């Protein structure tokens, strides 16, 4: 059961030429695809229905599309549309030519402070948007934080995302295994927006330190350390940065800042935030010099 060379949406009469294989995001296989008329290039996420035999699995895909289609923001992956034939589900998404923060992290390890500040701000701005629209992502991690040609961050993969339907709703189910998973989820006693602030906590730690805060050889031992709040921040991290991390990584979800407080932290308001980064920043640390020489 093999994937067509040209992807035809019958409703909109659009045709997409399947270009280069980008990789396998879970069930899906992703390709560079291009609209035959405009030649505009997108990421095509193609999932075979042979892996969607169970209603539960179908319901999750429908939910992901439902959530993601409703979203439009500078720091959220553009959802351009979706369609399906008897064999496949096709989702047409904003292409992010510079991959994700995971691949950045693997090249550069710990970032410089102004880089972190730069990316974190964009991460926060997109998450503010999600939260304003009553959406919790629930799996914010480096691999889901994509980068376009100008190194702007775009939040993707809404496969674990959920809608808060009513005020003070505490979700008690999360079908999935988030990476930077919050202690309320692991204890399994209900959760909401603060799950994403925890994840942003871990992301900020990873970006500045060069490894994740609760890492071990065993996933269960890692979950153990999250329960006990067992991490520590290196001495060389500046106290303003360290303090913000500490605020975000509290076991009590009610103690963490909300998403809208974050940009007002000293960390942002009293440090250098570059307006943009050069492409060299994928490979070489920037000195942020005051004039060419
Ligand atoms: C041209 O841009 C991209 C290049 C690569 C890329 O460099 N792929 C290499 C990986 C190694 N193999 C051997 C050769 C191909 C890549 F992995 C991803 C690229 N772009 C990209 N844009 C958007 C998405 C995206 N990748 N992801 C990634 C995540 C895992 C696979 C692609 C797919 C997605 F899910 F559709 C999705 O939602 N989004 C937002
Ligand atoms: Zn399930």
Task: Give one DSSP letter per residue of 218-234, joined into a string.
Answer: SHHHHHHHHHTT-----
Please state, in angstroms and as integers, the Cα–Cα distance from residue 191 to each residue in 56, 63, 168, 194, following that order.
21, 19, 10, 7
Residues 6 or more apart whose Cβ sits within 8 Å of residue 194: 182, 184, 253, 254, 256, 258
CB 194 within 8 Å of CB 137: no
Same domain? 108 vs 244: yes
Same domain? 40 vs 50: yes
- Is residue 170 situated within a structural domain? yes
Same domain? 80 vs 137: no
DSSP label of 30:
E
- Is residue 154 situated within a structural domain? yes
Same domain? 93 vs 119: no
Rg, the chain, Cα only: 20
- Is residue 282 situated within a structural domain? no
CB-count burial class (<10 Å; 0-12, 13-18, 19+) for 273 = middle
Same domain? 266 vs 197: yes
- Is residue 289 situated within a structural domain? no
**Cβ(171) – ligand 1 distance below 6 Å:** no
- Is residue 288 situated within a structural domain? no
Same domain? 214 vs 146: yes
CB atoms within 10 A of CB 125: 18
CB 110 within 8 Å of CB 154: no
- Is residue 172 situated within a structural domain? yes
CB 206 within 8 Å of CB 233: no
Binding site feature residues for ATP: 22-30, 45, 94, 141-144, 157
Instruction: Tell which residue, 187, 149, 146, has the closest CA to residue 170.
Output: 187
Alpha helices by DSSP H, 21-146? 55-69, 101-108, 113-132
- Helices then strands, each counted (H, E), the chain: 8, 10
Q: After which residues is the chain broken (C to N over 2.5 A)?
A: none
Which residue(s) pair with 41 in the sheet? 34
* Ligand positioned closest to the Cα atom of 56: 2
* Ligand positioned closest to the Cα atom of 58: 2
CB 200 within 8 Å of CB 139: no
- The CATH number for 180's domain is 1.10.510.10
Please state, in angstroms and as integers, the Cα–Cα distance from residue 35 to each residue in 15, 30, 78, 193, 275, following that order.
6, 16, 16, 37, 32
Residues 6 or more apart whose Cβ sits within 8 Å of residue 216: 222, 225
Please state, in angstroms and as integers, the Cα–Cα distance from residue 227 to each residue in 223, 230, 244, following that order.
6, 8, 20
CB 269 within 8 Å of CB 120: no
- Chosen domain end from 70, 99, 128: 99
What's the 56 CA to ligand 2 centre distance in angstroms? 7
Sign for the CA dihedral angle at 132, 136, 141, 143 comes to negative
**Catalytic residue (one of 9, 35, 139, 252):** 139
Sign for the CA dihedral angle at 140, 142, 146, 149 comes to positive
Solved using? X-ray
Same domain? 37 vs 116: no
Instruction: Tell which residue, 101, 99, 83, has the closest CA to residue 91.
Output: 83
Same domain? 241 vs 199: yes
Residues 6 or more apart whose Cβ sits within 8 Å of residue 52: 27, 58, 61, 89
SS3 call for 51:
helix
Instruction: Give, to the nearest 10 degrees, the angle between helix 194-209 and helix 113-132.
Output: 170
- The CATH number for 52's domain is 3.30.200.20
139 catalytic, yes or no? yes
Between CA 81 and CA 103 the distance in angstroms is 27
Per-residue tokens: 154: 């775009």
- Is residue 280 situated within a structural domain? no
**Cβ(146) – ligand 1 distance below 6 Å:** yes
- Is residue 235 situated within a structural domain? yes
Bridge-based pairing of strands 79-84 and 41-48 is unpaired
**Cβ(47) – ligand 1 distance below 6 Å:** no
- Chosen domain end from 79, 99, 119: 99
Domain assignment of residue 51, given as a range: 11-99
Instruction: Give, to the nearest 10 degrees, the angle between helix 194-209 and helix 239-248.
Output: 150
Between CA 162 and CA 165 the distance in angstroms is 9
Same domain? 23 vs 125: no
């Amino acid at each position: 059961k093999e994937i067509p060379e040209v992807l035809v949406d019958p409703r909109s009469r659009r045709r997409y030429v399947r270009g280069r294989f980008l990789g396998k995001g879970g069930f899906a296989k992703c390709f560079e695809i291009s609209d035959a008329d405009t030649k505009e290039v997108f990421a095509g996420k193609i999932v075979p229905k042979s892996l969607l035999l169970k209603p539960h699995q179908r319901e999750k895909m429908s939910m992901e599309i439902s959530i993601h289609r409703s979203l439009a923001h500078q720091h959220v992956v553009g959802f351009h549309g979706f369609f399906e034939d008897n064999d496949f589900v096709f989702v047409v998404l904003e292409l992010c030519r510079r991959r994700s923060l995971l691949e950045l992290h693997k090249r550069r390890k710990a970032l410089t402070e102004p880089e972190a500040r730069y990316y974190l701000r964009q991460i926060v701005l997109g998450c503010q948007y999600l939260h304003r629209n009553r959406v919790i992502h629930r799996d914010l991690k480096l691999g889901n934080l994509f980068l376009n040609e100008d190194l702007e961050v775009k939040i993707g993969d809404f496969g674990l995302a959920t809608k808060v339907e009513y005020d003070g709703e505490r979700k008690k189910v999360l079908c999935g295994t988030p990476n930077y998973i919050a202690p309320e989820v692991l204890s399994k006693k209900g959760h909401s927006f603060e799950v994403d602030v925890w994840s942003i906590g871990c992301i900020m730690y990873t970006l500045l330190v060069g490894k994740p805060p609760f890492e071990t050889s065993c996933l269960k031992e890692t979950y153990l350390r999250i329960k006990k709040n067992e991490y520590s921040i290196p001495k060389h991290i500046n106290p303003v940065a360290a303090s913000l991390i500490q605020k975000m990584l509290q076991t009590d979800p009610t103690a963490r800042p909300t998403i809208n407080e974050l940009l007002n932290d000293e960390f942002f308001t009293s440090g250098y935030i570059p307006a943009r980064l050069p492409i060299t920043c994928l490979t070489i640390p920037p000195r942020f010099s005051i004039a060419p020489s």
